[PDB]
Design a protein around this ligand. Sequence first.
Ligand SMILES: *[C@@H](C)[C@H]1/C(=C/c2[nH]c(/C=C3N=C(/C=C4\NC(=O)C(CC)=C4C)C(C)=C\3CCC(=O)O)c(CCC(=O)O)c2C)NC(=O)[C@@H]1C
Lengths: 162, 162, 162, 162, 162, 162, 172, 172, 172, 172, 172, 172
Amino acid sequence: MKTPITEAIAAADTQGRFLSNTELQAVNGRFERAAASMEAARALTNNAQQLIDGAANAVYQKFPYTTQMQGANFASDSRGKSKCARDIGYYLRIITYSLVAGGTGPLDEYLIAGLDEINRTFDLSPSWYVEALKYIKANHGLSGQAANEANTYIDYAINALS
Amino acid sequence: MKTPITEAIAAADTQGRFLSNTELQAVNGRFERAAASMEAARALTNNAQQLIDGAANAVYQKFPYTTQMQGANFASDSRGKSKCARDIGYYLRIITYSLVAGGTGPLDEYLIAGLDEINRTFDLSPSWYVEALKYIKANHGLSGQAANEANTYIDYAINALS
Amino acid sequence: MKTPITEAIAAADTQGRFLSNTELQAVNGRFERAAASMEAARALTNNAQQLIDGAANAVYQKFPYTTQMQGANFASDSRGKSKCARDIGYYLRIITYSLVAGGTGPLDEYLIAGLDEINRTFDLSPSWYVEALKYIKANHGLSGQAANEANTYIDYAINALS
Amino acid sequence: MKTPITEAIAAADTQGRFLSNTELQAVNGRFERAAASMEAARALTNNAQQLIDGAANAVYQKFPYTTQMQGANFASDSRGKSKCARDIGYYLRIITYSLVAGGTGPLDEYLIAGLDEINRTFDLSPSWYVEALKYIKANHGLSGQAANEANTYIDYAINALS
Amino acid sequence: MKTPITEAIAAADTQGRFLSNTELQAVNGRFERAAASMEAARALTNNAQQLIDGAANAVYQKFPYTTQMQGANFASDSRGKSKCARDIGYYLRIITYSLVAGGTGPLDEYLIAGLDEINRTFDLSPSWYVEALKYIKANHGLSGQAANEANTYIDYAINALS
Amino acid sequence: MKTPITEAIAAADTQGRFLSNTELQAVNGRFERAAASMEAARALTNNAQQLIDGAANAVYQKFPYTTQMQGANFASDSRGKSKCARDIGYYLRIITYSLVAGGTGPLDEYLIAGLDEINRTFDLSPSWYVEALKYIKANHGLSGQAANEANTYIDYAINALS
Amino acid sequence: MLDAFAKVVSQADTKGEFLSSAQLDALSNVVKDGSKRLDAVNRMTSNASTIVANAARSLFEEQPQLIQPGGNAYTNRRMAACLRDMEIILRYVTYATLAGDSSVLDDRCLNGLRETYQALGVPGGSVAAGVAKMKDAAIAIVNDPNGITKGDCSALVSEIASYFDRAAAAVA
Amino acid sequence: MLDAFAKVVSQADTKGEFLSSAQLDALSNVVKDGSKRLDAVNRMTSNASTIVANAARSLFEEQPQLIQPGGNAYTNRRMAACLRDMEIILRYVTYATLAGDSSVLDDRCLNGLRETYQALGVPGGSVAAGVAKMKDAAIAIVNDPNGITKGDCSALVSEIASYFDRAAAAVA
Amino acid sequence: MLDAFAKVVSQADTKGEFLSSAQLDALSNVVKDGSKRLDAVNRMTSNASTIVANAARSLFEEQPQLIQPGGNAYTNRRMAACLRDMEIILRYVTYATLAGDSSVLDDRCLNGLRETYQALGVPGGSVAAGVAKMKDAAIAIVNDPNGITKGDCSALVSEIASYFDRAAAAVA
Amino acid sequence: MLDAFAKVVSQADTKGEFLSSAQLDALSNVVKDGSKRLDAVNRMTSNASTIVANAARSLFEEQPQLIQPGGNAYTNRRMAACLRDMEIILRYVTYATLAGDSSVLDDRCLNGLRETYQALGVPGGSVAAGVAKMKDAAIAIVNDPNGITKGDCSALVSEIASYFDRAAAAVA
Amino acid sequence: MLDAFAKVVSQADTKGEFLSSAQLDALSNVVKDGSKRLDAVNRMTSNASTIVANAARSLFEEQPQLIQPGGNAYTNRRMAACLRDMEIILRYVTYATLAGDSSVLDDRCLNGLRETYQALGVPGGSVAAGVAKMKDAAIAIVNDPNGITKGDCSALVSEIASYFDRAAAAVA
Amino acid sequence: MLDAFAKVVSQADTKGEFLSSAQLDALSNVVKDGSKRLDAVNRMTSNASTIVANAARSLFEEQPQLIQPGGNAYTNRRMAACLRDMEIILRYVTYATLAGDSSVLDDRCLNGLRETYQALGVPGGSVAAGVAKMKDAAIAIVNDPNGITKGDCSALVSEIASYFDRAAAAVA
Ligand SMILES: *[C@@H](C)[C@H]1/C(=C/c2[nH]c(/C=C3N=C(/C=C4\NC(=O)C(CC)=C4C)C(C)=C\3CCC(=O)O)c(CCC(=O)O)c2C)NC(=O)[C@@H]1C
C-alpha cells in the first residue's frame, strides 16, 4: 500500500541500499503533516452519515433522472438508492483511510484500480460521483491545513473520475 | 542528483503520475530539516581549513609509515602531502554539498561512485580516510540536530569505505 | 487495417511463408459475403441523413435531460445538438466503411481506439450512443443476410460501448 | 493443427478478443470450399493403392539406380521397396488429411517438419519424392475445383521438397 | 573466422578480461600442430589438379547417372562437368585454407553455412560430394599426423554433408 | 572450473556442436605445457612451509606496522600472525591448484571471486599479499618454463590485487 | 488446438489409416450445418456484454457475501477481475463452438484454473454458478427463432450447453 | 535532474569551491518560500483534469480544422493522444515547479519534442496555443485567494509562467 | 497494411465522406474478379520454387561475376542469402496480388531495401534483373489457359506486372 | 508492504468500517514517538558496517568449522555471500523498524529463506546465531544515551528486538 | 563442469590440502595418455554421423513399433527429435572423453532426462538400447588398429564404455 | 576477427586461389616466431596493472587540468572510467599482438571511439598521450632481457608499437 513510509522503503529496496537521510526526512514530513490529516479523518468520520445522506441527495437533485428512470443502474427504487448511498460511503470511508495512511494507497488499491471498468460495465456515470464528492468538499466544515488535506484527497478522487 | 525533491519527482515520473501528497509531504520534510542541515554546512565551511589540516595530521600520526615510505601512494614528500590534504578537502566539501542538497546525491555522484576502484588502483588505504573522517566528526563542534546531520553524512562516508 | 485479406496476409507474414489455401479460402469467404455487406452499406448510405437525424432524436426522446441540462457535454443548445448529430454520423459512416472493408478495421482504428478515454474526458454517456445505435438497427429496413451484416457491426459498436 | 478454423480462433485469441465477422467469413469460406476438397479426398482415397503402386513404379523407372545400388537408402531389395511404397503412401494419406482439414496443418505437422533432416540423415533424394508426387498429380483423374484442391496440396509438398 | 587464436581472443573478450595462460596454451598447441597441418596443405596444393580431376571421375564412376540424365543439376554436358569440377576444387581449396588457419573457420564460413539450402535448391545430392571427399582421402598420399590433419578436415566436411 | 579442457568443451557446447580440430589442438597445448606446470606445482608443494614462513616474515619486514598496530586486522598478536600465515598458505596452495589444472579456474573460484569485498570488509591491505607473492616469486628456485608457469600465476594473483 | 476436422484426422493418423466413408460423411454434416454454427457464435458474441453483466448482477444478488467488504469480489480491482473471468470463459466457449471441439477451451482456459482459484481463494463454486447463468442466457439467445431463417438448432444447442457445463465443472 | 539546491551544488563543484555565505542565504530563502511552492503544485495537480479539458475544448473551438475529418486530432485515438500530450506537458510543468528548476521539463519532456511533432505532422503551433491556455488557467488557480493564507506569490507565479512559456516555445 | 477495400475507405475517411456509388461499383468489380485473383496467387505460390531457381540460374548465367570467387553471391552463405531475397520479393509480390494494393510490398519489403543493399554492397541492378526474370515466368504461369476456366485475366496480369516492376525499381 | 498505519487501514477495510476513536489515538501515538523511531533507524544504519563485521567475526570465532576448508563460509566468494546475508537481514530489520510493521521483512526477506538455505546447504542455525549477535549490538547502539535527548525508548527497543528474533527464528 | 584435473583439485580444496605426490603422479599419467585420448575423441567425432544413423537404423529394425503410425518416432518431426537425441548423447559422451570426467555429461545431459522422457512418453528403455549400439560402434572405431600408431588403449576404451553405460542407465 | 593466418586465407579466397609457396613460407615464419609472441603477450598481461597505473599517473602529472575540479577525469566515477579506458585499449592491443593482426583492435575498440569521445567531451588528444606512455612501458617490458631466453624480438616489438600507434591515432 502506498504510504510515505512504504514509498521510502521501496525506494531504498529497489536500490539494494539502507535507508538514507533523504528517506528519513520524507518520513518526518509525514509525521509533521499527520496532525492535519488526522483532524480531517476524525471530522469526516464523526459526520459520516450526514455527509453520505447529504451527498446522495445532492446527486439526486443534480441528476433527477437517476430517481425517475427504470434501470438497475438507477436509484428510482429502494434497491438503487441503497446501492448509491453504499457507494458514497465507500468513497468517504476510503478517503479517511488515505488521510490516516498519509497517502493515496487506500484510494488507489481499494477504489480507483478497476474504477473505469466497473463504471462502464454497470453503466454508472462518473459525473454522479464527482457531484457527491463536490458536496463532501463543500460540507466537511474544516479549515486550515485539515481542510487542505481533506480537499486534496477529495480532488484526487475527482480527478480519477474525470 | 539524488535529493528529496528529485527523488519525489522520479517516483511520480516512473509511474507516469502527477505528484501526490505522499511526495509533497516528503519535500516539506526536507524543508523542515534544512535549518539543521544548513547550520552544519556553515560550521564545516567556516572551519574547513582547520578541519582539513587537523584531519591530515591525525592520519599521519595514526599511520606514521605514510610520511616515510617513499612510494607514490604515500605522503613522504610535499607532493604526497598535498594530494592527501586535497583528498580530505574533497571529502569535507562534498559532505557540505550533501548537507545543502538534503541527501546523499553529491557524495554518491562525486565521490563514492568509483571509490573502491580508485583506492585499489592507486593503492590508497580506506582506513586512512576513515581516520580523517573520525577526526572531522570529533572536532566539528556542533550540537543538537546540526551535529546529527553532520554525523549522519560523515558516517555515510565511513560506511562507504568499510 | 484489419480486413479478412489483411488478416490472411499478416498470418502468412508472421510465419514468413507464402499464402496457402488455408488463407485463400478465407478470402473467398470474404468475396462471397460482400454481396450482403454491400447491400447493407448502400442502404445505410442512401438513407444516412434520415437515419442520423432519427437516431439523434431517438436519444433525445429516451434521455430528455440531454436537451435540458446546461453544460458543454449536453445537447441543450444548437452547438450541442450539432455535436451529437455529428457523432452519430461518424458512427454510421464508419459502420459503412466496416461493411465495405469486410471487417472491424475501420471501427477499431477510427472510433473504438481511445473511445473510453474520450467519453470520460468530455463527460459523454455511452448509453446515449447505444440508444442511437439501437435506433439505426431498428430502422435500416434491411432483411436477410444484409440485415445480419448491418446488425453485426452495429452490435460490435454497442459492445465496444458496454 | 493449422486449419482455417484454428487460424481464425488463433487470430482472435492472440488479441484477447471475441471472434468478429472478419473471422466468421473466413470459416464460411472454408465451408464453401469443403465440397471440392472432400471430392478430391474421396477420389484419392478410393484409388490409393493404384496411385501408390504407380508412383513407386514411376520413381523406379526414372531413377534406375534406386533398384540396383545395394545401400540401405535404396530399393534394390524387398526391404527397400517396402520402405519406398510406405513413404509414398504416407504422402498420399497425409495429403488427403490436408484436404479434409481444409489446410496445410496435417502436411506441416506429420510430414514437412523435420523432412529435410530425415532426407539428409538417411540419404534419401528429394527428387525421388517429387517424381512420385508428379505421378499422382498426373493420374488422380480429377477435374474442376476438385483437381485444383488436389494439385494445390501436391504442389505444396513438391515445394517443401524443393 | 574461427581459428584457435580467434577463439582464444573471443573467450577472453566475452568475459572482458586479458588473455591468460588458459588461452596462451591453446595457441601454442596450434603452433605445435602447424607442422603437420602445413605438410598436409602443401601436399594437397601441389597435387590439387590431379586430386580434383580424379575425384570428379570417381563421382561419375560411382554415380554414372550424373553423366547420363538430362537436367541443369547433372554433369551430362560440358557445362555440368565444369560446374562439378569447380565445386570439388572449392572443397579442396577451402580444406587447405582450414589446414593453414588451424581450424574449421574457412570451411564453416565459405562452404558449410548455407550448404544444405544450396543442395536442396539446386537439386545437388550430398552423396556426390561425399564420394569426391572419400577419393581425396584415399589418394592424398599423406602419412602420419599430416594424414590425420587432412583426414580430420575431410571427415568434417563429410559430416556436414550427412 | 575454467581449464583449457573445460573452455574447449564450453565453446563447443555453446554452439551445440561436436569438438573440432580447433579445440583438440588447444587441449594438446595444455597437455604439452603440463610438463612445465606440474614441475612448478611439485616444487612449490615440496617447499610450501618454508615459502609460507618466509613470505609472512617478508610482509612483516616490509610493513612492520602490521606487527605493532592494535586491531583484529593486524598481526600484532598470535591470533593475527596465525591468520596471516593461513592466508598466505591459501594463496600458495591455490596457485599450485591452478598449475595442476592448467588454468586460472582454481584462483578465480576459490580466491579471487569476492576478494575485494573481503579485503574491504576486514580492512586487509592488498599490498600485504602482493609482497607475500613477490617473495614466493623470488624464492621458488625454479628455472626455464616451469619458472615462467609459476610466475605467470603469481602475477595473475598480483594483478587481481591491484 | 483442434477443430472437429483436425480431431478426426489426428485419430486416423494414429492408426495410419485413411478416413473412412463414415468419418467423411460425419465431417460433411458438420459443413452442412455450418451456417447455423456461425449464427450461434455471432449471436453469443453480439450479446457478450449483456450476457456477462446480467449473469454477474444475478450472481451478486444471490450471493451478497461476494461483494460485501472482505468479500472476494469487493473493491473495484477484484470486481474487475471477476467480470473479466466471466468474459474470458464466455469467450473460450464461443471459440469451442466455432471449432466444434472443446480442445481450445480445455487447453487455453480450463486446465489449471481450479488450482489457480484455490491459490487465490476465489470461490470456484460461485464462479460455476455464474457460468451456468451465462449458459442459460446464451442458449436462449442462440435458439431464439426471431430474425433468422427457421430451422432446427437442437444438436448445436446441446453442444454449446456441454461447453458451458464443462467450464463450470472445471472450477466447481 | 536538478532541483534548485543541486543546481548551485553542481556549479560550485565544477569550480571546486565551498558554497558562499550568500549562496547559502539564497538557498535558505528557497526553503522559507517552500510552503507556497507546495501550494502551487497541489493546486495545479488538484485541478489537472479541468485545466486540460477546458484548454483542449477552447483550442478546438478556435481551430476546428484540428478535429474535422482529416484533421490531426480527428478520430478518438488521435484525440486521446492530443489530450495525453496536454496532460504530459502540464505534468512536467508541475515537476519543474516543485524542483524550482526547468531541467526535468527540458530533459524528459521538451528535448526533441519539436522533431517528434515534425515527423508525425503534429501542428506544434497549435500545441503551443493549447499550452498557453493551460498556463492562464493554472496561474488563475494558483493565484486564487480563497481558502489559503494571504500572501505574495508573484515570484512563484512568474516562475511557473516561465515554465509554460518554455514548453510552448519548444514546440512552436 | 491496406487491401483494395481499405485503401478506398482510408481516402474517404480523410474527407469525412461516405463512399460514392462509383467507388462502391469499383469495389464490387474487385469482388467479381476475385476468383481469378485467387488463381493468380495460387499459381505463383504453387510454382514458387521453380520461379526462384530458374530466375537465379539464368541471372548467374548472364552475370558470372556474381558467383565467381570474390563475387557478391560467392560462398554458400551469400548464395543462400541471394536465393532468399528472390523468394522474399516473390512472396511479397504475391501478398500484394492477394490484397489488390502494393502497401504490404512497399511497407514490409521495398522501403529502405536500396539503402540496405548499398550498405552491404549488394548489386541492386542485378537484383532488379533477377526480379524481371521472376516476373516473366510468373506472368506466363498465371496466364496459362491449361487447366482453368477460360477467361480474360489481362487486367490482373498488368497489375501483377506492376508489382514486380515496382520491386525492381526500388532496388535498381 | 504495510506500515503501522496501512496495517490498521487494511483490517478496517476488511470489516467495512471507519477507524474508531481508539484506533486513531493509537496511531497518533505512533506519530508522537516518531522522532525516536527515526533515531533508531539512523543509528543502526550509521553503524551497519561494524554491526555486520563484528557479529560475523564473533560467529566465526565461536564456530571455526564455518571458515575452515570445506566449510560453508570458506573461499572468498562464500564468505562474501555470508557477509551479504548478514547485511541483507540487518537492512530489512531497519526497514521494519521504520515501518512499525514486520511485513516488509517477512515478505521480501524471511519467506522461503529456510528452504533456500536447505537447498544450498547453508547452516541456518549458524545464521540465527549471527543474527542474534547483530541484535545485541544494534540494541546497544540504539540505547546509547550519549549525543541524544534523554528519554524512554524501551517499547521501540522491544519492537526492534522482536524483528531480529523473527529473522533468527525464520532460519533456525 | 570438471575435467580430470579439476576433480582432484576440488577434492583437495575441500580438505585444505596440497595434492599428494601420488595424486600428482596419477594426473601426470592422464597427460601421458593425452594423445590417445585426443585420437579417441577425434575418431568418434569424425564418424559421428554414421554412428548415429547406423544405431538408429538398427534400433528401428529391432523395434518397428517405434516407427509405425502412432509410434513414438513416427512422423518426421518426432524422428528428427529422436535422431537429435542420439546425436546429443554421443556429443556429451565425447565431451566426457575429452575431460576425463563424467560431470559435463551428468550435469548438462543426463540429469533430469528420465523425468523429461517420462513426461513426454518417450520409451527410455528403447533410447538405452540405441545408446548401447552407439557404444559398440564407437568402441570399434576407437580400437581400430588401422592408420594409427599401435599401442594399448584398453583403459581409455573402458572409460569411454563407462560413459555410454552411464547414459543408458540414466534413461532406462 | 582475423588472425595473421585468416587474413592471408581471406585474401586468397577473394581471388579463388590456393596459397602460394611463398605465402605458406610466410605463415610458417609466424609459427616459428610464435614462442616470442606468446612471451610478449604474457609479459604485457602480467604487468597490465602497473602499465595502466604508471601511464595514468604520468599523464595527470603532465596535464593537471584533467583532474582538477571541472576536469574530465575529476570525481572518482570519471577517473574510474578513464582508468578503464586505458585498460581497455591495452587489452585490445594485447589481443592484436596474439592475433598478429589489428582487426580485433579496429573492429571492437577503435572504430567509432573518436566520435564517442567527441559526444562525451573526452579529450581524445590526452587519451592518445596516455596510450603512448603505455606503449613505451609495454615495449620496455617486452624487451627486458632478464628471465628469458635471449634472442631478437625487434620485428615483434615494431608490430606491437604499430598497434599502440594505431590506437593513439584513432582517438587523437
Ligand atoms: C500563492 C501560491 C498563494 C498563497 C500561498 C501561501 N501558502 C501559505 C502557507 C502555507 N501553505 C502550506 C501548504 C503545504 N505544507 C505542506 O507540507 C504541504 C504538502 C502536504 C502543503 C500543500 C502550509 C502548511 C502553510 C503554513 C500554514 C498556513 O496555512 O498558513 C502562505 C503563508 C506564507 C508561508 O510561507 O507560510 C502563503 C502566502 N497565498 C496567497 O495568497 C496566494 C494565492
